[model samples]
Target chain A: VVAAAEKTKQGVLYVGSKTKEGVVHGVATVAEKTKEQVTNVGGAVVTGVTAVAQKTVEGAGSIAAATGFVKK
Target chain B: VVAAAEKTKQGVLYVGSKTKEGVVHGVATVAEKTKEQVTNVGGAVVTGVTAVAQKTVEGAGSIAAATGFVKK
Candidate 1:
């Protein structure tokens, strides 16, 4: 996991990650803060992956809920 | 494949593509020009794919050259 934390010109804290293949996987923005604060906040977490997983779970539940009604 | 070309605030031309999943596939920047010029230049060319292919060819060539040097 590669993490980059920087402050934007507008004074926003930007954290991002690039995969081994050099593809940007995710980015997060927050209020401007010190380097220590940014480091403590951490980066490299895969919120995008988790979001997809959560969507899949909700979709599966909806499909299961509709099964009996559609079959009958 | 989706293509978009627009002029940036700094008067530079920006071109990009988004996949079916709405993920940005590629982006390119160039000097500002007429709409006709930017449109004629085109987007969604997938130069990254070509770059990877070129790198693979070079890597294979290097491996072939090293084969004779290391073996027998």
Candidate 2:
């Protein structure tokens, strides 16, 4: 099992990681930077997915209507 | 003005166009292809949206919990 954590270093939370196999990566960042990364990714995964869903529905409507023309 | 239409051609509904414009893009495909594309897109959107929302709420709880540690 691997364990990961953010360490408080020199008045900053420096993110770090450890694995049962002993590989580890560590880094530190400003609070603002952390917030920016988190917010940006979270901010529109839903938005893009929402846009795709709308387009899918619209395209389906076109298909459905196109099929409705009475055939001989 | 531009309008489009799909036509039955060669025993196949060869979807085509007849708009007020002179340019035309025509194509043909099986009915199953259209049904599958629409169904697949529609199926997982609601599922994925629910997941994103759950993750957001869970992340907020983690942040809120971490904030509870006392500071000067």
Candidate 3:
């Protein structure tokens, strides 16, 4: 492959960190990814997270689960 | 809502604009929102958009959707 070795966890892909461990896009990315996986497995038509709700998990650092509204 | 006046268009929320026309976080924000809305209407747990598919629309201006993989 024309890319470096990489791996995924839950949904967060290890993309090289500051300590050479690997840096990630953000915490929300993982959450969103994980959410979809389970929904597909269960075979349901639930929506993803809402804007306000997703914002809670946006960026890095300790995250929050402010809103649980993922539509219907 | 304890926030500034915001209106949603197709899922793209107009928070404000650099030229006072209303600037948004990014184009994908709308895409993500729109996706969720449609899913809810149809009533199926198809999940949300994938990351790589999302990155193409994460920024402003013309966007791209290079990959179609959504972990499923």
Candidate 4:
């Protein structure tokens, strides 16, 4: 059991490091491509933020309505 | 001229570091939201990659025909 647990721990560390490295490379590639198509990248981020902001405000309205303290 | 160059270099350093820091924070925030919404992130990446792949193939066809080696 101890040996298996030790092996599993090592495997987890190896996989985690690889995942981190992959993400780093992905970001680096994205940054490079950004030089040519920054508009697309900017649009993605702006859309994400706008959608999240709208969701947050909608949630706030739901909470307010539940409390009967604010009219929609 | 020497002092002004040095000051401009320092300002560039400061702004570059801040921009890097901002990107780091944005990625961190995205990673957190990714836990709840991995689908959206995956979809965005998949869409981008698919679009790029299509464009590449189209460009390759254009290049091939220009060389008079491939048929449309």
Candidate 5:
């Protein structure tokens, strides 16, 4: 376990870490503010597993892409 | 455009693809069922930009890692 600051902007801070497996995880940002302030910023945390899975499906083909396509 | 099924489990199917930039996009899964089934399956899609940004920070050091740690 370690702690280091990567970047800070608009009262928001970014940090990163490495997993025990040496697999480089990603940086996560934290906005230091009240719930309303955080809500206004509107950020999401995504797992690597989910990202890889989505990438796989998008590249698979048109039909496969259709399955997860969020219709706006 | 290409389409291929990677795996199917519990009515969920996975697929993959290649982006125009040539980055190997990953597969996505779709559970063939009603909205409830799909929602119940529960999946998320992440953009490459997000993934890379995350990697840069995590590899940097410890504090970066703490920012994103979800307290269970």
Candidate 6:
């Protein structure tokens, strides 16, 4: 098995966190129209998904930061 | 503005939460091979993303349950 350096593992975490954050946000925006009423099924689902994505991004960011994977 | 019943809104949240949970898990599995060593860059990143995804799924599930979107 090929093992990586600690620094390399850190870089992996950083890239993974960033990548997932961006991808999820894109899904939130793209999944439903923002102009729709929140009461409508599409809009409500979109809003909830967006909310979940926001929290997920925060969670991912925290992991990256705590692990020293992210410097910026 | 097209308005929906409160129950409808709850349904929306349920679907949204379930959808995000499935999608994220799929991403985690698809993005990295499961057989690789965790110390390797690819494996480490995959592990981080998977961890983040787990937390995100839990968060989403809570929202769904608390919002009355999920009863089962």
**Best of the candidates, lDDT:** 5
Estimate, for each residue in A1-72, the C-alpha lDDT of model 3 and write its tens digit: 011111223433222111222222211211232223212121122332221123221222211111112432
Name the candidate, 2 or 3, with the larger DockQ value.
Answer: 3
Give the top-scoring candidate (DockQ). Answer: 3
Clashing pairs in 6: none
What are the runs in model 4 whose C-alpha is more than 4 Å off? A1-18, A24-72, B1-72
A12-37 in candidate 6: lDDT tens per residue?
A: 22211112232332111122223322
Residue B31 miss distance in model 4 (angstroms): 29
Error of 3 at A31 (Å): 15
lDDT over C-alpha atoms for residue A13 of model 6: 25
Candidate 3 regions exceeding 4 Å error are A1-72, B1-18, B29-72
Model 6 chain A: lowest-lDDT 10 consecutive positions: A59-68
Interface RMSD of each: 27.5, 30.8, 21.5, 27.6, 22.5, 23.6
Tens-digit lDDT track for model 2 on A5-72? 22222322222222122211112122321211210010111221111221121111111111111213
The estimated TM-scores of all candidates read: 0.14, 0.12, 0.12, 0.13, 0.18, 0.15
Query: What is the Cα-based TM-score of model 6?
Result: 0.15
- Alpha carbon deviation, residue B23, candidate 3 (Å): 2.2
Candidate 4 chain B minimal-lDDT segment of 10 residues: B1-10
Better of 3 and 5 by lDDT: 5
The sequence of per-residue lDDT tens digits that candidate 5 reaches over residues A1-72 is: 222222222433333322232222333222332232111111333545224322222212221111111222
**Where in model 5 is the C-alpha error above 4 Å?**
A1-72, B1-29, B33-35, B38-45, B49-51, B54-72
lDDT of 4: 0.16
Give fnat of each prediction, in order.
0.00, 0.00, 0.05, 0.00, 0.04, 0.01
- Candidate 6 local lDDT, B1-72, one digit each (tens): 111111111211221222323233211112222233212111112211222232342211112111112212
